[PDB]
Design a protein around this motif. Structure first.
Motif, mmCIF file in Angstrom:
data_model
loop_
_atom_site.group_PDB
_atom_site.id
_atom_site.type_symbol
_atom_site.label_atom_id
_atom_site.label_comp_id
_atom_site.label_asym_id
_atom_site.label_seq_id
_atom_site.Cartn_x
_atom_site.Cartn_y
_atom_site.Cartn_z
ATOM 1 N N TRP A 122 -33.155 -48.161 22.884
ATOM 2 C CA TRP A 122 -32.663 -48.368 24.249
ATOM 3 C C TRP A 122 -32.423 -47.034 24.951
ATOM 4 O O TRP A 122 -31.976 -46.068 24.327
ATOM 5 C CB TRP A 122 -31.343 -49.151 24.266
ATOM 6 N N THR A 123 -32.730 -46.994 26.250
ATOM 7 C CA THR A 123 -32.542 -45.796 27.068
ATOM 8 C C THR A 123 -31.743 -46.140 28.332
ATOM 9 O O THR A 123 -32.097 -47.086 29.043
ATOM 10 C CB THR A 123 -33.901 -45.174 27.472
ATOM 11 N N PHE A 124 -30.671 -45.376 28.613
ATOM 12 C CA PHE A 124 -29.832 -45.626 29.795
ATOM 13 C C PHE A 124 -29.430 -44.327 30.484
ATOM 14 O O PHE A 124 -29.482 -43.260 29.879
ATOM 15 C CB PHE A 124 -28.570 -46.407 29.408
ATOM 16 N N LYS A 125 -29.030 -44.438 31.759
ATOM 17 C CA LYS A 125 -28.606 -43.281 32.557
ATOM 18 C C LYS A 125 -27.102 -42.994 32.421
ATOM 19 O O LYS A 125 -26.653 -41.891 32.748
ATOM 20 C CB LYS A 125 -28.957 -43.492 34.031
ATOM 21 N N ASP A 126 -26.328 -43.985 31.947
ATOM 22 C CA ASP A 126 -24.877 -43.833 31.780
ATOM 23 C C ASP A 126 -24.432 -44.413 30.447
ATOM 24 O O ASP A 126 -25.086 -45.324 29.930
ATOM 25 C CB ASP A 126 -24.128 -44.514 32.931
ATOM 26 N N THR A 185 -31.094 -46.258 18.728
ATOM 27 C CA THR A 185 -32.128 -46.546 17.758
ATOM 28 C C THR A 185 -31.605 -47.553 16.760
ATOM 29 O O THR A 185 -30.652 -47.301 16.021
ATOM 30 C CB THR A 185 -32.585 -45.286 17.006
ATOM 31 N N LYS A 186 -32.244 -48.698 16.766
ATOM 32 C CA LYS A 186 -31.880 -49.793 15.874
ATOM 33 C C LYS A 186 -33.137 -50.477 15.340
ATOM 34 O O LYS A 186 -33.744 -51.313 16.021
ATOM 35 C CB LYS A 186 -30.960 -50.783 16.614
ATOM 36 N N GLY A 187 -33.537 -50.093 14.116
ATOM 37 C CA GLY A 187 -34.729 -50.655 13.495
ATOM 38 C C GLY A 187 -35.997 -50.211 14.201
ATOM 39 O O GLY A 187 -36.298 -49.015 14.253
ATOM 40 N N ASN A 188 -36.726 -51.184 14.737
ATOM 41 C CA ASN A 188 -37.961 -50.921 15.472
ATOM 42 C C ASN A 188 -37.710 -50.961 16.991
ATOM 43 O O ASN A 188 -38.658 -51.015 17.785
ATOM 44 C CB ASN A 188 -39.040 -51.939 15.076
ATOM 45 N N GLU A 244 -29.056 -46.259 13.402
ATOM 46 C CA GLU A 244 -28.327 -45.138 14.012
ATOM 47 C C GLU A 244 -28.431 -45.155 15.526
ATOM 48 O O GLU A 244 -29.524 -45.265 16.085
ATOM 49 C CB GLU A 244 -28.892 -43.809 13.521
ATOM 50 N N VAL A 245 -27.288 -44.999 16.174
ATOM 51 C CA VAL A 245 -27.224 -44.955 17.626
ATOM 52 C C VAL A 245 -27.072 -43.488 18.023
ATOM 53 O O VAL A 245 -26.406 -42.728 17.318
ATOM 54 C CB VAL A 245 -26.045 -45.815 18.181
ATOM 55 N N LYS A 246 -27.713 -43.077 19.118
ATOM 56 C CA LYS A 246 -27.626 -41.679 19.562
ATOM 57 C C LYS A 246 -27.455 -41.558 21.066
ATOM 58 O O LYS A 246 -27.850 -42.437 21.829
ATOM 59 C CB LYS A 246 -28.880 -40.898 19.129
ATOM 60 N N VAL A 247 -26.813 -40.468 21.476
ATOM 61 C CA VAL A 247 -26.612 -40.180 22.888
ATOM 62 C C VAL A 247 -26.941 -38.725 23.168
ATOM 63 O O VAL A 247 -26.401 -37.825 22.519
ATOM 64 C CB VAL A 247 -25.174 -40.447 23.396
ATOM 65 N N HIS A 248 -27.826 -38.506 24.129
ATOM 66 C CA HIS A 248 -28.200 -37.161 24.510
ATOM 67 C C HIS A 248 -27.811 -36.889 25.968
ATOM 68 O O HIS A 248 -28.471 -37.375 26.895
ATOM 69 C CB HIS A 248 -29.711 -37.006 24.298
ATOM 70 N N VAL A 249 -26.728 -36.114 26.173
ATOM 71 C CA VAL A 249 -26.280 -35.754 27.524
ATOM 72 C C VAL A 249 -25.779 -34.306 27.558
ATOM 73 O O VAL A 249 -25.468 -33.734 26.513
ATOM 74 C CB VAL A 249 -25.179 -36.721 28.082
ATOM 75 N N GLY A 250 -25.692 -33.730 28.765
ATOM 76 C CA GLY A 250 -25.227 -32.354 28.920
ATOM 77 C C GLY A 250 -23.724 -32.204 28.726
ATOM 78 O O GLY A 250 -23.013 -33.197 28.560
ATOM 79 N N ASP A 251 -23.251 -30.951 28.766
ATOM 80 C CA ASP A 251 -21.827 -30.616 28.567
ATOM 81 C C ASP A 251 -20.903 -31.185 29.655
ATOM 82 O O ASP A 251 -19.719 -31.423 29.395
ATOM 83 C CB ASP A 251 -21.653 -29.095 28.503
ATOM 84 N N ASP A 252 -21.444 -31.402 30.863
ATOM 85 C CA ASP A 252 -20.654 -31.918 31.995
ATOM 86 C C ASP A 252 -20.345 -33.419 31.883
ATOM 87 O O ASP A 252 -19.299 -33.868 32.362
ATOM 88 C CB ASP A 252 -21.387 -31.647 33.313
ATOM 89 N N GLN A 253 -21.246 -34.183 31.254
ATOM 90 C CA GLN A 253 -21.054 -35.631 31.093
ATOM 91 C C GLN A 253 -20.820 -36.026 29.623
ATOM 92 O O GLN A 253 -20.587 -37.201 29.326
ATOM 93 C CB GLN A 253 -22.264 -36.386 31.658
#
Length: 71
Positions: free
Chosen positions: A48-52, A42-45, A3-12
């Motif tokens: 990845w974390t990114f700013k954009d 999130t992929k297995g073990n 599972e891939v996930k993205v956590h960002v605010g309402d503006d972005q």
């Protein structure tokens, strides 16, 4: 989990949602109360974390859409 996930605010969120939807992968997106610009994959073990989202999409595309890993 694959599972891939993205956590960002309402503006972005709209920008991240557009790039993620354009990417076509099953990703979960959550809007924070404050201004946040970080994608978590999130992929297995691995994770990845990114700013954009482009950073995440380009990195995921190269690793996940170009490279393959067997279990």
């Amino acid at each position: 989990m694959d599972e891939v996930k993205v956590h960002v605010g309402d503006d972005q969120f709209e920008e991240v949602s557009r790039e993620i939807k354009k990417a076509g992968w099953k990703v979960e997106v959550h809007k924070h109360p404050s201004n946040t610009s970080q994608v978590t994959v999130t992929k297995g073990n691995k994770q990845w974390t990114f700013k954009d989202p482009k950073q995440a999409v380009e990195f995921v595309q190269k690793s996940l859409e170009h490279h393959h890993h067997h279990h």
